[PDB]
Design a protein around this ligand. Structure first.
Ligand SMILES: CCCCCCCC/C=C/CCCCCCCC(=O)O[C@H](COC(=O)CCCCCCCCCCCCCCC)COP(=O)(O)OC[C@@H](O)CO
Ligand SMILES: CCCCCCCC/C=C/CCCCCCCC(=O)O[C@H](COC(=O)CCCCCCCCCCCCCCC)COP(=O)(O)OC[C@@H](O)CO
Ligand SMILES: CCCCCCCC/C=C/CCCCCCCC(=O)O[C@H](COC(=O)CCCCCCCCCCCCCCC)COP(=O)(O)OC[C@@H](O)CO
Ligand SMILES: CCCCCCCC/C=C/CCCCCCCC(=O)O[C@H](COC(=O)CCCCCCCCCCCCCCC)COP(=O)(O)OC[C@@H](O)CO
Ligand SMILES: CCCCCCCC/C=C/CCCCCCCC(=O)O[C@H](COC(=O)CCCCCCCCCCCCCCC)COP(=O)(O)OC[C@@H](O)CO
Ligand SMILES: CCCCCCCC/C=C/CCCCCCCC(=O)O[C@H](COC(=O)CCCCCCCCCCCCCCC)COP(=O)(O)OC[C@@H](O)CO
Ligand SMILES: CCCCCCCC/C=C\CCCCCCCC(=O)O[C@H](COC(=O)CCCCCCCCCCCCCCC)COP(=O)(O)OC[C@@H](O)CO
Ligand SMILES: CCCCCCCC/C=C\CCCCCCCC(=O)O[C@H](COC(=O)CCCCCCCCCCCCCCC)COP(=O)(O)OC[C@@H](O)CO
Ligand SMILES: CCCCCCCC/C=C\CCCCCCCC(=O)O[C@H](COC(=O)CCCCCCCCCCCCCCC)COP(=O)(O)OC[C@@H](O)CO
Ligand SMILES: CCCCCCCC/C=C\CCCCCCCC(=O)O[C@H](COC(=O)CCCCCCCCCCCCCCC)COP(=O)(O)OC[C@@H](O)CO
Lengths: 263, 257, 94, 257, 263, 94
């Protein structure tokens, strides 16, 4: 199959608020796919539909041709060894120093000796540049580097899909430059399909091959990087440029003056 | 009425909070034993729950036994029965004070630290990143902490009773001058192994299941914010103390009624 | 699916160097790198990080008891992994 | 030795933790009365500390008085002295159980909620943004919560003793059939206003100052992270329970010795 | 005095880690001054030296000619009515809805009636665009808007100096576009001197008149926006562009291979 | 430092419209906008948000009991504040 992930027509509701009415998006194999949008639309829920967590209300999510919501529990656990997820916190366990975090999925689904496990984790920690930090605890890790240590844990079982949940958020320009270099290197080597969810437009568009913009609950635009910087939609142009006023209003919906100004 | 519909609304969502708590404990304790993977996990949790609770248990047991020895001396000395002080101190600890006060201090110190720990593991997405590695967090995180609480509160209760009896004799024999042969021999033929020693262990096991189940569920069901974790930590101390004191009356009417 | 056969001074591997099928070849060490001077590797399908670490331990063993060891036949995708993992030139030749 | 230098290092930083706690309470309670600005602030804090603690106090007092009435009945019925059950229940609550158990539940419910509240106000920079508006946060935040805790624990103790005496009579008179004229009249000429009612109020005021000062300081001195707040909330329950039980022995040796 | 704030030669230590050896910077009156640098250098401590919080070890901070560390407590509280500070959280009180937050410094140092206090707060809430949100609680505020409500509280007493502590961090491009519009409007009107501390380079340089770059514990560069995009220093060029490797190394300081790779 | 003097139909203000010195002029309402048709404001030093809200209440009072009220003499920095606070044209003329 040319598409690794294929969401057909997905809907979701959280209590009574509606997120994602009838969205549809494809993730090609071997390419970096971006999903961008505003900062309250709940687009980290999109990675939990793909990951085999909370079920949709109506739709079909296909991981390499197989439907994830209509799937057994034991079938879900052996499919989840093919995909990985890097959380925004860098979700490291708070005991177990950086060596024991990376080696944790390799002590669970493998039969490797105590040598070739020391060599494998040291090679994974070197690909992200934290081989010297192998004995530090995660409380000393200065959380720009906690996302790099949780990226070495994500490539441990050699997955087919890595889902990134806001990699560039609150980060310095040097730290954003390191993470852009690492996602580009792990896609050239290893052939991994990457799905990046973010709202940092100039960093993400420098590496993505196909972007999808989720302005309202629909999927209002998609295309390449050059084909999105020429789109004429007003909702698309406000997000990609940073205009203060547009279809998302600067003023809150208020009443009128002369009733609170002169009550 | 608009009041009867709101009361039945809270009566429905109380039923499915009891149902979520029954599903959390059933899926944590049942299936595929794994005695070798969980044995190092039990020893670390037996340090956090048991070893770190020894300071509040040893120091409180000496003070409570000393208050019992001082207050029971002034009662018994009216009727010239002060050689029965050791029978009074030991029996009032093996029933109703050893089990109960050690469970209220276990709920405040170890029950609060268990709700705060698990709710912090959901705020930093550690439990969701374990499901992505195809590891069940109910068997790997919840169940080693359950058995560490069921083991360590019966062991902390027997330390509480031991240093409480010693503190009572420290007032009666050493300070007030009761004959130490009369003190200890009156205690030894009043304390039965079945009515007193076994009934102390039954109470502290029923209390250890209840306090640990309440404390683990309130962290697992918390709202994963910094204010929602602190609200669930307070909810553990209230629900554990009302359940320990409520079950203590029902077990007193059964065992000694 | 990983078998090895020796022709005096070659240790021609065949199959796949996945992580799961390497426990025979790991627990046959010091018995397969006796007089080996060259590792052929021309008949392997694909290799990952677990298999590449086993390859580093065979070249290390066949150097401490003997010569400098050469290789051939590689897929030129074992070289992209050594590029990514930043392996020095003395632990993996050419 | 490298062990004596590390012990004297912890003995120095314990001295300046007691000094930071004395400076926090002195600068909160002293200077420029402000009776009109602080009077709405007292009523809101008297809701969080006092009104929200009534559920754990009323329900625990009924159960504790019922256990006392059941356990004291089986002792007194041997010597045909079971009409003295009301004297036994009321005196064992006005000393040593009314003050102490209501202070241990106040420290777990209201003491934990006060440490968690103040440490959250430093994690979100609310106390630093009050200093930038030239408002002293020690007088505006700390001192209305101090007086709300000193007022409400003596008021919660007298509710605990009242519903505890009622629960004891609920077992003695209603269930076991003691004559209710003998029950209440034996209580009324055993309870003195000076030895029993005033000494209950002195204990609950000393406990209210200690529990509130410990609980306010551990939030003000906490490390303002989500894990450092939960560590300080546990530290309140340990330090308050060791100080309530320790002071309870010293006041028992004074008042009734 | 032409300079509102004037740090002469300031030093600070936190326990035994040294921050800011011998820095010196001036803030002109009526201009927007930027202070940029990496993401662990503790540059929010710089706003607490100016604000009359924690004292330096050696130096002189002059607010309009008067030394803040050598200043009485009652003199500090009447000087602090001239400066304001916007914290990164938007440090709103968690009771007291958005009207009562803005009106809090106006009920403390003023004598205004109950009319002209209703009209003043409604005018301040309209300048930031949250007049309709006047009755919401801060827990419902969607924290991009919590920084706008805490900006209306900061302009309540009409200060001379507003210190911004990371206004653009973890924010969407539309939300960053609103805050850039507001800091530019409150400087054109009202003549306020603004001090912005950040590590978001393209947003800050679009409004700043003079930037100061704090790479190491020194003050290694300063100048205008065009005069900083032509500086040839290697430490300056890595921060302003986002280069992964340079004088701040990509690799952690490690040992060597052949001891952990082949132990 | 804020005094007001009436010349039949003008309410010429003088001084500064700061927040602190406006309690006399606030508690002299309905007694200073009796037959006022124009507010001079040419002799004020500077004005802030507290003083601008008092100016909105005088024009509102002198309109409900009379005409439409005009102004003059403003500093053209009272107009930058009305630009920032987004005041409509009917509560502050021209
Ligand atoms: C010819 C002339 C004749 C002259 C003759 C004149 C003189 C004649 C009499 C003189 C006075 C007699 C003196 C009496 C001295 C004996 C008093 C004594 O020892 O009492 C013991 C106390 O233990 C007890 O249960 C009391 C034990 C439990 C105490 C209750 C706990 C207190 C706290 C409540 C919990 C609150 C919740 C927890 C708090 C949060 C009862 O043990 P007992 O022997 O019965 O054996 C156990 C079994 O038989 C059950 O009774
Ligand atoms: C929800 C998760 C479940 C986790 C379970 C956690 C672990 C559960 C227990 C562990 C050990 C319990 C230690 C208790 C030791 C006491 C055991 C004991 O000997 O007591 C017997 C009675 O017990 C009794 O009434 C029954 C009382 C014991 C029950 C106390 C725990 C209650 C909950 C237990 C539930 C599991 C039970 C499964 C059983 C099917 C008395 O007879 P005994 O020979 O002395 O002389 C009789 C003479 O009087 C005439 O022959
Ligand atoms: C081998 C022996 C096995 C025996 C097995 C017996 C089975 C015993 C069951 C225990 C269940 C324990 C579950 C925990 C329930 C704890 C009770 C509880 O939840 O507390 C409050 C209700 O209290 C209440 O109405 C009163 C609650 C009752 C406390 C529970 C008593 C346990 C049973 C004792 C009954 C004695 C009857 C004696 C009759 C003579 C809640 O309010 P609240 O919104 O503020 O929440 C705080 C927050 O929501 C603030 O917003
Ligand atoms: C001719 C033939 C002759 C035949 C004659 C034969 C028969 C002759 C005798 C028969 C038996 C007599 C029966 C005795 C019945 C009377 C027993 C009784 O009422 O005891 C009262 C209990 O109060 C008390 O202090 C006990 C009160 C306090 C109890 C201690 C608290 C229990 C818990 C501990 C706290 C733990 C920390 C908190 C837990 C976390 C003492 O009140 P009292 O009157 O003294 O006045 C107060 C003042 O004088 C101090 O004593
Ligand atoms: C650190 C911050 C401080 C905050 C302070 C918070 C508030 C402080 C107290 C509030 C009210 C206390 C209510 C107590 C009511 C009890 C007061 C009371 O009447 O008790 C008297 C003794 O008291 C005594 O031993 C002395 C016991 C009372 C002390 C109890 C609180 C201890 C701490 C108090 C410190 C402040 C005191 C300032 C005083 C200079 C007995 O004589 P009475 O006529 O009955 O018959 C005598 C007869 O036996 C022969 O004439
Ligand atoms: C009008 C009457 C006024 C009377 C006035 C009398 C004055 C009474 C002073 C009270 C001070 C209370 C201050 C609070 C001190 C509380 C004591 C305390 O801090 O607890 C532990 C020490 O316990 C300990 O060694 C034992 C601590 C003692 C507890 C305090 C007792 C209070 C005084 C009772 C003495 C009776 C002597 C009787 C002699 C016969 C600390 O360990 P820990 O690192 O794990 O921390 C946990 C965390 O650090 C885990 O890493
Ligand atoms: C070894 C053998 C012994 C084992 C002992 C077993 C005992 C332990 C078992 C389970 C405890 C585990 C935790 C269970 C849940 C904890 C108790 C609970 O239900 O929680 C709240 C209490 O509701 C409350 O009003 C308390 C409600 C009443 C509590 C029930 C009393 C006990 C059962 C009496 C029946 C009464 C029926 C009517 C009487 C005829 C309900 O949250 P609520 O909806 O507010 O949502 C808002 C927000 O607080 C959370 O959603
Ligand atoms: C009346 C009293 C009767 C006698 C009572 C005697 C006293 C009580 C006896 C035994 C209980 C001790 C339990 C042993 C606990 C040992 C377990 C332990 O090491 O816990 C660590 C420290 O704990 C600790 O607070 C150190 C515990 C200190 C114990 C308290 C000693 C106080 C002595 C000075 C007080 C002066 C008062 C006046 C005395 C005259 C916590 O770190 P954590 O594991 O997370 O990580 C590791 C790394 O951080 C530790 O370096
Ligand atoms: C109304 C009248 C009644 C009023 C009653 C007044 C009583 C209330 C007063 C103050 C409490 C307010 C809070 C004071 C501070 C709370 C108690 C305290 O000191 O804290 C820790 C306990 O140290 C500890 O080992 C506990 C250490 C011992 C506690 C002292 C025992 C009580 C005093 C006996 C003297 C012993 C001297 C030796 C005996 C001769 C020390 O933190 P530590 O350094 O670990 O840093 C690491 C990290 O935990 C915090 O920095
Ligand atoms: C043996 C027992 C003896 C009798 C005991 C009788 C029961 C106890 C009596 C009085 C104590 C009640 C205290 C009154 C508390 C009133 C104060 C209050 O309103 O608190 C709010 C709710 O509290 C609450 O948990 C609501 C409190 C509920 C009280 C518990 C009633 C349980 C009854 C059903 C249980 C079934 C068990 C079986 C019974 C047969 C907390 O929200 P908060 O302020 O933050 O914001 C406002 C907004 O969130 C509230 O809508």
């Amino acid at each position: 199959v040319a598409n690794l992930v294929d969401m057909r027509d997905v809907s979701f509701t959280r209590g009574n608020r509606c997120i994602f009415d009838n969205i549809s998006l494809t993730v090609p194999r071997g390419k970096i796919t971006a999903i961008m949008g505003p900062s309250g639309i709940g687009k980290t829920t999109l990675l939990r539909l793909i990951g085999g967590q909370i079920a949709p209300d109506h739709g079909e999510i296909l991981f390499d041709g197989e439907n994830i919501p209509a799937m057994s529990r034991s079938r879900l656990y052996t499919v989840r060894k093919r995909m990985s997820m890097l959380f925004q916190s860098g979700a490291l366990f708070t005991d177990m120093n950086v060596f024991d975090n990376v080696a944790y999925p390799l002590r669970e689904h493998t039969q490797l000796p105590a040598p070739l496990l020391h060599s494998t984790v040291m090679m994974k920690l070197e690909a992200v540049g934290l081989r010297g930090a192998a004995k530090l605890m995660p409380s000393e890790l200065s959380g720009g580097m906690a996302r790099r240590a949780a990226l070495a844990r994500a490539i441990a079982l050699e997955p087919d899909l890595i889902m990134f949940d806001e990699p560039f958020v609150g980060q310095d320009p040097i730290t954003m430059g390191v993470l852009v270099k690492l996602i580009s290197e792990l896609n050239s080597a290893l052939g991994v399909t990457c799905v990046v969810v973010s709202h940092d437009v100039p960093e993400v568009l420098s590496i993505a091959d196909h972007a999808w913009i989720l302005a309202d609950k629909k999927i209002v635009a998609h295309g390449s990087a050059q084909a999105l910087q020429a789109n004429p939609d007003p909702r698309v142009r406000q997000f990609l440029d940073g205009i203060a006023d547009g279809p998302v209003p600067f003023r809150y919906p208020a009443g009128d003056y002369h009733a609170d100004l002169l009550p | 009425l608009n009041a009867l519909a709101s009361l039945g609304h809270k009566g429905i969502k109380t039923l499915r909070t009891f149902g979520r708590a029954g599903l959390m404990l059933f899926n944590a304790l049942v299936g595929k034993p794994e005695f070798r993977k969980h044995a190092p996990l039990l020893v670390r949790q037996l340090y956090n729950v048991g070893v770190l609770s020894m300071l509040i248990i040893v120091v409180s047991g000496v003070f409570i036994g000393m208050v019992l020895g001082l207050q029971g001396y002034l009662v018994l000395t009216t009727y010239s029965a002060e050689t029965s002080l050791g029978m009074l101190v030991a029996l009032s600890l093996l029933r109703e004070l050893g089990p109960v006060v050690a469970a209220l201090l276990f709920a405040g110190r170890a029950g609060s630290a268990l709700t705060a720990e698990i709710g912090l593991m959901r705020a930093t997405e550690q439990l969701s990143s374990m499901e992505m590695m195809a590891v069940d967090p109910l068997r790997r995180v919840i169940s080693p902490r359950f058995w560490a609480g069921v083991i360590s509160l019966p062991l902390l209760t027997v330390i509480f009773v031991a240093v409480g009896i010693w503190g009572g004799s420290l007032v009666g024999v050493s300070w007030k001058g009761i004959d130490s042969g009369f003190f200890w021999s009156a205690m030894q033929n009043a304390v039965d192994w079945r009515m007193d020693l076994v009934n102390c262990l039954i109470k502290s096991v029923v209390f250890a299941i209840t306090v640990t189940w309440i404390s683990l569920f309130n962290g697992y069901d918390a709202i994963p914010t910094s204010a929602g974790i602190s609200r669930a930590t307070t909810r553990t101390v209230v629900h554990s103390s009302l359940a320990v004191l409520g079950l203590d009356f029902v077990l007193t009417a059964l065992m000694f009624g | 699916s990983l078998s090895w056969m020796q022709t005096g001074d070659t240790l021609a591997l065949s199959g796949e160097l996945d992580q799961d099928v390497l426990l025979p070849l790991w627990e046959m060490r010091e018995e397969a790198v006796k007089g080996i001077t060259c590792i052929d590797l021309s008949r392997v399908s694909r290799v990952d990080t677990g298999g590449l670490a086993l390859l580093l331990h065979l070249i290390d063993l066949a150097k401490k008891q003997g010569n400098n060891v050469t290789l051939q036949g590689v897929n030129d995708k074992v070289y992209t992994l050594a590029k990514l993992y930043n392996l020095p030139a003395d632990v993996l030749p050419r």
